[model samples]
Target: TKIPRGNGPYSVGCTDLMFDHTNKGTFLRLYYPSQDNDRLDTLWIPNKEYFWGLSKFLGTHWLMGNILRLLFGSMTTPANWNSPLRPGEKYPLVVFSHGLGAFRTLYSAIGIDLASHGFIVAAVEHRDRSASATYYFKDQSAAEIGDKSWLYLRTLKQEEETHIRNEQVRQRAKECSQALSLILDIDHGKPVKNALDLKFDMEQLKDSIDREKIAVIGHSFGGATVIQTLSEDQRFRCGIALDAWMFPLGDEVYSRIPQPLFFINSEYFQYPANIIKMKKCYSPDKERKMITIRGSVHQNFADFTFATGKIIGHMLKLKGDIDSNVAIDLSNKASLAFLQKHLGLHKDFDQWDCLIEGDDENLIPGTNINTT
Candidate 1:
């Protein structure tokens, strides 16, 4: 099988950036259109520490890290690495939050596609013990110590579900907001020094963002973060939740979001209880929409779905019943249409608006797994 390239007109470029202070220096993987197309590709899972951390999370032997590393070490993502930004174009911004136990690079497929279509995408790596693993440099020297950390998300115990989950969601929301502030500052020419001496020019980002056309998007735990962030920050014009695990959200947030919201669900992951909670997010004056990918599961929104073969992918819960690429295409296209609709972009994304209504045979309008 082959790694999938984005299905858009512009070539994509990607790189890493770190904030070096707040929250122990926020780390982000950025994807944007590039002026050059011949640059080397970015590594898919570049951190060996994260590979070992994944082994621990899965209760696998230590040797599994070596095997995973060997398999993916040379694997390059679709985007060009460290290429110069596509010049003279101001693009809309989309801040992406990954699922629990997921780090910044895990959502490259979604980010690359969005960037190819003229959106600057920032995939934030949360430091609040939400990821399986993440790292940051503690100092600027050549021998600066890198802080390697492994984090495990707690599954809510029955009696402690609301309080524990609400706490987690609050932290995730704060991280998302911080990421947005960082990117907006970069766009305004606020200089930040880089830890890695790569070809990414922070100066290229000056005045290159559409201030009013910003949106927040995420998957699973990140999805709940989207809801909380949209409610708490008026700067985010819209939000899209992919199979949102709504239980983590506080009850106070349910009726507070005043911006447009869209929910793109997986047929197997959403149930009546969560559906009822999602219903509370809808008010007559609010622009709300939803749809379900007919045969998809929770993992369809991330790149892990493409990492394994059919049988193993299903067993590992990394892929769904539907084709991984097909499921993601549906999700990405629908998201672009939603972003265009709510962000008021001049792009011709209206061609994809039909996706929201489940016009495709493989999609179900609204939802499919309502348990009640």
Candidate 2:
């Protein structure tokens, strides 16, 4: 219940979609403006297995899963579950990527806010084994019979880190690209079946997308995915990297991303090495913006920031020194401004453009980490 409701005019609705139903299939959680206001709220963590996966990611034994489930099992994000999409105008699309040890639903805070502002946010669940846990059916029969096969995050040795992370980032970018194509196809009236038995119809998305305006955004590893995706696919007009972890990206991507890029970082999560890697992407001819949130930690960008009380949250490194609501408000507002400018949308988001320039009291115009 600590998760804040979106501060926009439109009501938000959420649902999940899995097409082709296999290990390589496209799976994503959709958050969009909704026509219905009476639907039930969406469950924050729908499956118990996700909690188990999270425990493994945390390097804890299986018993920790029971404790996590007991605490977060009944939690609901602030969005309508299975509500019909708001019809009429074509909304811009954003394909969101999740951080390491996180899945699609973990980024609902960001997705819901964007949806409430009239953007269709597709938070893609990565099959690269980078996520804490994700699932897909083996085939049509398994999907029909409700049998799910889950994949958990991989534990890599120091020697395997370089090559494995490189491989995973490539796969993550492809997943983002694939998700975009799937949504675009649906927008163009391509008939597709929803692998899950959800009330929201995939047909409703037809002709409801502002195809010309598309962007990608992500946190941590997902932030790197944003950069990789923009370099590989011009379909993503721009990218916003939330406290990006630059190590996973290959050297080739730095010079190839010609689109507008923004870096929003948390105070404690960044260091000179990471910031230096980020600086390499800069070119006098290319557009880039960077900002740091005062007293914030990386978890401020994830929903776990609001999952517990201040004391417990801080203990678990889930909450930052700054208030979660205040920090996220700044991040979300600045992102809206960036998206409006880059996506060429005709929205009032321009009013908050000052935030992008680090004009806010709690924001540093650029990173405080000095490479020199």
Candidate 3:
């Protein structure tokens, strides 16, 4: 994979930590600062089951699974996988929600960047059928069979759009809140037995979380998850929505979020319909901000944009008209500033406070994408 390392002061380490006894169990891809600089690299899209699930999602043959594995199987991301997390440092936490048709591992680029900037980022694998594919243990023995095996989410019909999508958003919010609780529990020294035995050292997480500094962020459907999560969980200090697909959010939530919210939009994906709903979130007392990446599209917010060549990225809707690195840099930098302000962190991120002010050459201060 061509995913770049985070441009921060710390070296990044990552691991997969699974909690088997939760509602349906929680699988989180955790990225944090690492103690060892020479550790092994992390795998990109490591699960074979996920590839098979993807093939099924695209209605492709089984051979595509093997082909995909062969192609991306050895690809290594820029993080140190299985490395012990840096010791004795309390860092802020951010729980990331993946977009529809995306699994936990799909957002490594974002996770890596956040972790490098002194944060413990957990990208949760949602089991609510919102992802293209996901799995959980069904029995005490932790058998990956029957209801515990890999399950693929089906594409929704036009008729089920509003109702079913709303229901899914509700479930996604529940999962996001559950994930926040799980991480906070871990931070508080709660014991967890790893089901996969992947050597997730729980001790490394003890007393390592800044309990008061937490945030929620996501893209697309996951963007809606951020809005719902913020409305439901006061534990989250703020939220950033990247190219948010606002249809999944309920009208009740628009005016109910007590925390600060920021919307970073794309030039191509957002329309007047979505922007109008986003506007409903305004309040006199709340901090609401929005910006547009001049030539970016929805895919510019994900790892897929960095996975392929420019031509193929455009063909797959995996890239925007702007440079992928530039788009992500702008998004991540501005988010860091937002988190610093809302979380009250003493960092240099304040320099980026005006990032969304649209004074930058590559960014539009506010959006009028589809609203002439």
- Top candidate on lDDT is 2
List the lowest-lDDT window of 10 residues for candidate 1: 142-151
TM-score of candidate 1 relative to the true fold: 0.93
Badly placed stretches (over 4 Å) of model 2 are none
lDDT-better candidate, 1 vs 2: 2
- Cα TM-score of candidate 2: 0.99
Clashing pairs in 3: 358-365
Q: Candidate 3's residue-wise lDDT over 215-252, tens digit each? A: 99999999999999999889999999988899988889
Q: For candidate 2, write residues 184-274 as lDDT tens digits.
A: 9999989999888888899999999999899999999999999999999999999999999999999999999999999999998999989
The ten-residue window of minimal lDDT in model 2 covers 33-42
Give the number of colliding residue pairs in candidate 3: 1
Score residue 281 of candidate 1 by CA lDDT: 88
**Whole-model Cα lDDT of every candidate shown, in order:** 0.84, 0.94, 0.85
Better of 1 and 3 by TM-score: 3
After superposing candidate 3 on the true structure, give the runs of residues whose Cα lies further than 4 Å from its correct spot.
21-23, 59-63, 143-148, 370-372
